[PDB]
Each structure stands twice: as C-alpha cells, then as structure tokens.
C-alpha cells in the first residue's frame, strides 16, 4: 500500500545511514559503475545482503542499475564525499539521541513547561547537552560549517561587506562564515561570538565567549545572525533582537540570514525545531513582526536559494 | 530539495507516531472534520504546536484541510481505530528497540557471526528477546493478529478446509487464523503451535508450546505455516520444512502462505527482515527450491492480494 510505506518512511533514512555512515558510499566516487562482487572482496561487506540494500537504494533513486552494477544518481554524488553537509545530516538525523527526542514529541505537545521533546528525553536543552556530548557537538557544528560554506558566495554577491570595518558573527559556531568571508574581503576586524567550552583560533578572526540571551557586545558597524532565531520561541527571539538594538547605534546594521517558511517547501524542518528547541521556521512577515517588536526596521530584503531551503536576507537598523 | 527530504524520511514516520501513539488520531473517527481549537480544550494539548503537526500531516496526505479544519484521508481512516494493524505497525516501527537495531544494520553487513543487527544491539535474537519484553511481544503479537484477521476470508474463499479433520497452525502466534476459520468451518480438531510461556485460551483451539526448529508433531492431515519463513535463513527455512516432511504422511498436506517478492512492490521489508532476523522476502521459485531440498513438492499454487503486500499460497506434500 501507499500507507504502510508512508508509515515505514524511517526505513529510507536508515538504509541511507547504513550506506553513508559505514563509508560504503565513498566507493561510488565520480559516478563510477561499481561491481558489488569486487567491493565485497575489497571492503569485506557481504555480497548478497548488500546487493539487496542496493536494490532498495535504486528504488529510492539513490543508486542507478546498469549491467549488474550500481552508481550514485547525479543528485546523490554528495554521498561519495564524507565532508559533504548531506553526509553529516544523515549521521545526526536517525542517531540514538534524535530517535529518543522524536519518541517524546507526542508527549511534549500535552505539557506547558517550556521543555523540548529533547530535554524530556535527555534532561537538558539541546545546546546545554551538546556541552557534555562530543559526538553531537562535533557533527552538528560540522553540518552548520558545511551549510555556511555553501551560502558564502551567495551572501558576498548580494551585499557589499567592503564598506564595513568591524564585523561580529553572533552564534557563528566554528566561525566558517567569517573565515571564508575574510579570504575575499581583507583588512577588516573579524569576531565570532559563541558559547565556547574550548576556543578555536583563526588568524583573521577574534573568537569571543558570550550569550546573546544576556548581552550583545557593542562597537561593531556590522552584525551577522544566521540560522539562530529558528532555535528559539517568539519571546526569546525578540529578547535577542532587543540585545542587538541596545548594542547597535544608527550607523550600525544587523544582517538577519535565516531559512524562511514558504507553502511550496516541506514543513518537516518546522517539526524538528519543535522537537529539539521548541523553535519554529517563520515567513518574512513573521520575522519582521519580531524585529518591529524589538525596535528595529527593515532597510533591505533579499531571497537566497540554497538546494535544501530558501533563505530570507533582512538588513535591520534601530528606530 | 528531493535529497534532504529523502534523508529526513524518518520525520514522516515520527510525525504519524506522535499523532497515533498519543491517541489524538482516535478523535478523527468516521472522517469527521475536527476543530483543532475544540480538541485543544477537550484534550488539553498545545493548539499552535499541534496545528503545525497537522499542517505536516496534510502535506503527507494523512489529514485533509477544509474551512480551516482537519479530517483523516480516505485511506488513513485506520489511524482513528486503535485496534487497526497500521496503529500497531507505527508504534513498533520507530520504537527504541527497532531504532537501535537500524544503527547496527550498517555494522552487521561486514560481520558474519550469524548475529542480526537486533542481536548485536540488544544481546539476543528477536523472538528470544521478546520473551523478556512485554511492550514488544504484545504489540508484535497484536499486529500479526490483525493482518491474520484480514486474510481469513481470502484463504476460505480459495481453499476447502472442510476436506480436513485435524489442523495444526505452526508459528500461529495468538492463533487468530484457526479461531476465525473454526467459526466458519465446524467439526474439526484445531491446534496452534508457537513459543508460549502462558498458553492462549480459545474453546475450539488446543494451544501447544513448541519449537519448529526441533520438531513438528505428526497426526495432522493439514499443516499451515503463515508469515514464518521470511524470519529465517535458507538453511533454517530448509530445516523447518524438513521437520514438516518428517511429521507428515502421504495423505498429509502443508499450506505455505507467505508474502512474496514481486518487483512492483517496495524492498523496504526485505531490509527490515535482514535487520531483525537475517531473513529475506522470496519469490515463488525461491520458496519452491527450499521446499524441494526439504523433500516436499508443490501440489497447488495461488496468488492472494493484501493492501500491504502480495502473498504466495503454496500447497506442499512429501515426495
Ligand atoms: N546563547 C548563545 N550564545 C552564543 N551562541 C549560542 C547561544 N545559543 C546557541 N548558540 C550557538 O548558536 C549556533 C546556532 S546554529 C547556527 C550556526 C551558524 N550561525 C550557521 O548559520 O551556520 C550553535 O553553534 C549554538 O551553539
Ligand atoms: N522456533 C519457533 N517455534 C515456533 N514458533 C516460533 C519460533 N520462532 C518464532 N516463532 C513464532 O513465529 C511467529 C512469526 S510472526 C507470524 C505469526 C502468524 N503465523 C501470522 O501470520 O500472523 C511468531 O508468533 C513467533 O512467536
Ligand atoms: C514494525 O516493523 C514491522 C515488523 C514486522 O515483523 C512486520 C511489520 C512491521 C509489518 O508491517 C507487517 C505487515 C504485514 C505482515 C507482517 O508480517 C510479516 C508484518 C510484519 O511482520
Ligand atoms: Cl530432496
């Protein structure tokens, strides 16, 4: 039926996970037609049982079958690259911690504690738990690093970063964004403010420990806040934007870069933000409301098309 | 993208689970258009957060939207029924024990200990572990009971059970098949064999604790083995069928009734059977070979269509 396969949608994610997490997918580099017989002998994977996974991978459209051999689809070439964002997305998606956070989702709806399905399963909010666990922090920050790398060229194209002097990336993580931005735009003061248990060091970047719930450090004519607000409630979102409005002056500008809600694209991400953070995806009009509540006004708006999600580029200044 | 949503296929199964396991789906009985505001009052659930879950279920085609209200789709009416086979499938599908068995599937492909991905995760093979877990055994035995109920009328329609005197259902579970057959076909001796601690009780049925790997008891002219062989290797399947051959005389018959591999339908179940049992889904020809090696021959063959899978009906007799 169409129902039983929709109920069994987990199997798709899990079949891809086995393929990419083991590193079997890395043997399919450069759209090569792999002999599963050869791969079995070399890699030590069972021939019969992996042939059968490959059959299910063709059905999903991850593999293509020609002359009793398999290649990655033109679209699924990224599964050959361990450093691809898709590969890091798979690692987290159906990991033990995410699985148990989803099992509490149903329960999370009934209660009004402000506790995420993740917190109900593990005992601390996502980022407070990523302090303790190295597997989740190293893979999450890697994902945010890879998706940051793909939007660098799109951001530099639509905005002139060469007009600004001091740039602060609020919640940058590894700081990949300003690292890659500094390689095109030189002779600027670069700073990445995050929750740091250990300090990373980048020649051009000035890594600071902070908390944008508490205070944004003033003395910056450009502020960057990319993919943060979707990890927070409307109240917590306004609080962050008000900390900017207190830190900023009239000459200062805030770039609000975030995955935007559109009816065309899937809602699945909106749910995952609920599960992990009690967050949500928002439209431009919804982001503008939270900005007009915090005492900021939209100077400029631009749409960015990433493969995975459309983004909203909003330039915010104080009233 | 098409790729990121294929990677996030688990989110589909997770959203349905939170709807059906919470019993919120049971408020959508008889294709009624539910008011999410009304339900929020009645149930005590979060409106805004559940409104979003319902938006994602519409996208999947589980709910349908009219006048800002939600009904279950024509094919998703079964979610309102907590006795439906789909409602049991959902709960087992992404439960703790299955999830962790999928995380070991990757590893399981390289090793050859005769250990399943479930045995690697939990420390025992599927059915032996169910002896120790009431949540898994009850939900599993319930699922098997609901799918066995659905096939009863088709099996009676194609085969004459009136010609037989003594009938044994091997691996019959709760025994739903012979329970529903004994109500239509009276005056027979009905026996059900399975791995029992506490024996089931039905007035018409003699429930026998046993192990089909060790021995099948003789003295029955009809044997039935439904949805068993797909949980076992070629060798274990041959062993099982050999025990039938030893147990049967010339006038004795065996009904091998099992879901069959047809290219049109998904392979996702073939992977699950590998994860849980090192089992597989087989074509008619493959079933005929294993039987032929056991020393049995095909007498009659018939196709049965169920919504979730096609079935092979193979009447088997000793050479
Ligand atoms: N109070 C806080 N102060 C600083 N950083 C925080 C924070 N709460 C969360 N963060 C960090 O903010 C990041 C959100 S994910 C976004 C990362 C990056 N801006 C990108 O777009 O790719 C995480 O790295 C998280 O650790
Ligand atoms: N060694 C063994 N001997 C007997 N029954 C066994 C067994 N190993 C597993 N089983 C049983 O085999 C069944 C497989 S599920 C199929 C159940 C039933 N025939 C139906 O079609 O609905 C389970 O009920 C399990 O308890
Ligand atoms: C939760 O994961 C599952 C484990 C299972 O063992 C099964 C199923 C799901 C089924 O959906 C299923 C459907 C119809 C007939 C079935 O019996 C062969 C099954 C079955 O066995
Ligand atoms: Cl033989």
Gyration radius of chain A, to the nearest Å? 22 Å
CATH topology of the largest domain in chain A: Rossmann fold
Instruction: Please name the fourth-level CATH homologous superfamily of the largest domain in chain A.
Output: Vaccinia Virus protein VP39
Number of strands of chain A: 9
Can you list the ligands bound to this structure?
Answer: S-adenosyl-L-homocysteine, 3,8-dimethoxy-1-oxidanyl-anthracene-9,10-dione, chloride ion
Oligomer: homodimer
Largest interface comes to: A-B, 71 and 69 residues
Proportion of strand residues of chain A: 15-25%
Give the helix level of chain A as a range of percent. 40-55%
Number of individual domains of chain A: 2
Cα distance, first to last residue of chain A? 57 Å
- With helices defined by DSSP (H or I, 4 residues minimum), what is the helix count of chain A? 14
CATH architecture of the largest domain in chain A: 3-Layer(aba) Sandwich
Order of helices and strands of chain A: HHHHEEHHHHHHEHEEEHEHHEE
**Biggest sheet descriptor of chain A:** 7 strands, mixed
Q: Describe the strand arrangement of the main beta sheet of chain A, using strand numbers.
A: 5-4-3-6-7-9-8
Sum up the overall morphology of chain A in one term: globular
- CATH class annotation of the largest domain in chain A: Alpha Beta
GO biological process, one term (chains A, B): methylation
Active site (chains A, B): 230
Protein name (chains A, B): Methyltransferase
Pfam family, one (chains A, B): Methyltransf_2
């Amino acid at each position: 039926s169409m129902l039983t396969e929709l109920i069994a949608s987990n199997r798709r994610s899990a079949a891809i996970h086995a393929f990419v997490d083991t590193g079997l997918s890395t043997h399919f580099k450069d759209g090569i037609y792999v002999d599963i017989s050869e791969l079995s002998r070399k890699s030590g994977v069972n021939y019969a049982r992996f042939s059968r996974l490959c059959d299910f991978l063709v059905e999903m459209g991850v593999l293509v079958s020609n002359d009793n051999k398999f290649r990655l689809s033109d679209e699924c070439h990224v599964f050959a690259n361990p450093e691809s964002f898709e590969s890091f997305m798979i690692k987290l998606e159906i990991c033990s911690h995410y699985s148990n956070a989803w099992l509490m989702y149903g329960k999370s709806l009934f209660e009004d504690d402000g506790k995420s399905a993740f917190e109900m399963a593990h005992g601390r909010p996502f980022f407070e738990y990523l302090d303790g666990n190295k597997f989740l922090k190293s893979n999450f920050d890697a994902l945010m690093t890879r998706v940051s790398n793909l939007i660098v060229e799109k951001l530099l194209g639509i905005y002139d970063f060469n007009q600004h002097n001091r740039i602060l990336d609020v919640g940058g993580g590894e700081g990949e964004l300003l690292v890659r931005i500094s390689e095109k735009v030189k002779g600027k003061h670069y700073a990445v403010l995050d929750r740091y248990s250990e300090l990373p060091v980048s020649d051009n970047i000035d890594f600071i420990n902070g908390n944008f719930l508490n205070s944004i450090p003033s003395g910056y004519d450009l502020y960057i806040l990319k993919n943060v607000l979707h990890n927070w409630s409307d109240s917590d979102s306004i609080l962050i934007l008000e900390n900017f409005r207190k830190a900023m002056d009239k000459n200062s500008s805030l770039l609000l870069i975030n995955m935007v809600k559109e009816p065309e694209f899937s809602r699945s991400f909106d749910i995952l933000m609920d599960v992990l953070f009690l967050g949500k995806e928002r439209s431009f009009t919804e982001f503008e409301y939270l900005a007009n509540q915090a005492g900021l006004v939209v100077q400029e708006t631009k749409v960015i098309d990433q493969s995975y999600s459309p983004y909203s580029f909003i330039k915010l200044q104080i009233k």
